[PDB]
Amino acid sequence: ARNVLYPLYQLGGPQLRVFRTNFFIQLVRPGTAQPEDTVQFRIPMEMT
Amino acid sequence: FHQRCRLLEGMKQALWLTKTKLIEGLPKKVLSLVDDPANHIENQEQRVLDIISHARLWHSTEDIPKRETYCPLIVDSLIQLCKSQILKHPSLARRTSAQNCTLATT
Amino acid sequence: RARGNEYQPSNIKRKHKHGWVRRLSTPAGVQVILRRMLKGRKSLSH
Amino acid sequence: VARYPPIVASMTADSKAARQRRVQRWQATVHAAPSVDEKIRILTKMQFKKYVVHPQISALNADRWYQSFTKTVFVSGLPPAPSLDLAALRAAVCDCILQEQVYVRRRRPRSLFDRRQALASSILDQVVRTLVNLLAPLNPVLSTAALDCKRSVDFYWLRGEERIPAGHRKGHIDALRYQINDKPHNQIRISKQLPEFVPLDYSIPTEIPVMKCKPDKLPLFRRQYENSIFTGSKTADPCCYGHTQFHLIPDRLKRERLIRQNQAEQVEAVFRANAIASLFAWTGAQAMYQGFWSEADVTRPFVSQAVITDGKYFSFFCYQLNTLALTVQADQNNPRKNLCWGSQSQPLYETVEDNDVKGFDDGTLLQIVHFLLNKPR
RNA sequence: GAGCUACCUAAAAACAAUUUUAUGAAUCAACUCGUCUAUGUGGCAAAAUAGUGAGAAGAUUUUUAGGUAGAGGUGAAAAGCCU
RNA sequence: UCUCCAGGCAUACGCGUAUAACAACUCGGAUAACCAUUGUUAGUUAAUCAGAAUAGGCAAUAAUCACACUAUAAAUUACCUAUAACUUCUCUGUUAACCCAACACCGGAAUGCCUAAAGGAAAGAUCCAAAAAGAUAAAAGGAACUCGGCAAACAAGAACC
């Protein structure tokens, strides 16, 4: 999720869970030629 | 005492710490081993000369290799030359070599 | 010699000489920012 | 009796025909160079941007790409076609595993993240050295051979062409350059060439894969740096041929991580790609030490074999080099192709409990023994 | 305001070939400089071009980052330099 | 395809979409073709290239192929002792004919490799007037030119204040 605070994690802390996700992505047609397995996406800049 | 310690008095200090007496030269028993022509390896000089050349020049893609590389290379290469004698003397399979091992005593 | 090219760009030099952190280091530099904020400048510092 | 002038293109004109005529001019200076150093110097002195090929690579399906860059057909199995106390070898190899994992006492490294790959290096280093001294009496060649530890093998070649897409050079035709830089964990070099695995001009129905996209789409990146052709030693070294290479796969590519990433089908693919790239460079570099290049293709097939291990599992590969004519010009009418033979990975042992190795498999050891037993004819 | 320039600090670079020797030596490139003449003079250029020249292992040249600020700084003193 | 010319390819710094395709033909290129212009759409993919635990103890012996060899300007975290942790790949740079000089400026611009296999085009068409600029040749003479051998030369040697 973006524009939200992630709880600071220290040794032994819980897992970080996002129940509702603010990330929205779109599948785009490649500009150049890509292998048949490869797929292109446009994703928010804060997504890893 | 560790590897990078350099004794100011050299051998004299080392002898005192270890309570040992120094005799110049190797033991006569060891010397006579290679004096026998039977121990002489085939193409001994030519192979050794190649080992020196390989360690100094031919092993790397660089023009002039550095000591941090050829100094280990020469010794291991020489040991392999001395290890070929398993063709003549068996029972040299009853030994093995390890690398970078720790010794210590008090 | 030909003049006019006294500017040899360098981002490290620029941000060190005229940057936000540099301006706030001394009280006179803080007043540089205060003037520009009062004037309404879109760029307070490099 | 009319001496008509030869119908050839001009040397100095600005055309494609006149450029291909200035290409044969320098290419002829290689043909006419007496020494092999001059030939390799001429062929590599001019640096241009080239794809860097990594034998150990995390890219998907890199094995197929390396076949295309190399013109190699991959055949599953081994190439078509003396008891020496296997138990004695079994004891010695078992001792090596126990010695490093248990008995040896060293200063442990500063990074937890490197303690495992250092264990694998020491055992595979010991195993290779011991198997080279117990098998030496049976195979005298190993006695005079050279054993290299982490020495560099380099091959640089041209294959294919493209149109430069942008800039002042848009539309120009440029070759696709590749270079392989490799540091095999261990390798054995002999001064006499091994026998072939199949006759030159051997023909098989299999077809080398054809890649629609550029090498870039597979993560593969270009750089411009010194072009080098190296076999493990310089041309002056008498030991100018290759017997076997031993490769240790990095932890990043080992079985558990790949399965986690969901690329389970790539576990074997990692082994294949390393062999094709590692052996193609090494067999190719030997050929150019003998004076053979793209315009003087090899007369003798060049052979080498390698064993690839991830520290526990072992796989064995054999390579035969038939073609150095890979460029668009020199590959115009080439029926030859290069061949690589490989097998699935098999465990050599399972675990060490107490001071005994558990699960040791003799079958894999024989394959290592057979590879180390091959000799020149 | 020292991204130019003057000087400095720290960390880095470059110097082929030839002869002397053992070098702020010689011939001469790269590189640095700018002697003499012509062109140019709102010019290609708010100081250049083309030739010709001086140095070219050193008090050499170059790169990067830092320092010294106007009642001042820097100066192998030209009252030079400090956009 | 031909004729001719001879600093090109990378990286650093810098620049910031000038990248590529299409469509346009107003503005921009000192003119056209065509686009470097306008609009629209695309693009640069990295565990290797590049960027971003604590406390003590202790160091005489350059470099130059480092041997010989002398020298003078005197010259580059390691290794140990204890403590602590006990399997990891995310993030960011990646296009181009590009930057500093008001300009698509004959200027300025570090390094590695190489010297033509890479990169380029001096002439829009015509005409051959003067004056002007540049290159080449010179009968006989050879500084008589000129403030002065300036400039040039099939010369570039010698000496003296």
Ligand SMILES: [Mg+2]
């Ligand atoms: Mg200005």
Ligand SMILES: [Mg+2]
């Ligand atoms: Mg500057």
Ligand SMILES: [Mg+2]
């Ligand atoms: Mg400065």
Ligand SMILES: [Mg+2]
């Ligand atoms: Mg020199």
Ligand SMILES: [Mg+2]
């Ligand atoms: Mg001198």
Ligand SMILES: [Mg+2]
């Ligand atoms: Mg001179």
Ligand SMILES: [Mg+2]
């Ligand atoms: Mg002089």
Ligand SMILES: [Mg+2]
């Ligand atoms: Mg001065």
Ligand SMILES: [Mg+2]
């Ligand atoms: Mg005065």
Ligand SMILES: [Mg+2]
């Ligand atoms: Mg001024």
Ligand SMILES: [Mg+2]
């Ligand atoms: Mg374009």
Ligand SMILES: [Mg+2]
């Ligand atoms: Mg158009």
Ligand SMILES: [Mg+2]
């Ligand atoms: Mg456009």
Ligand SMILES: [Mg+2]
């Ligand atoms: Mg790095």
Ligand SMILES: [Mg+2]
């Ligand atoms: Mg680029």
Ligand SMILES: [Mg+2]
């Ligand atoms: Mg203009």
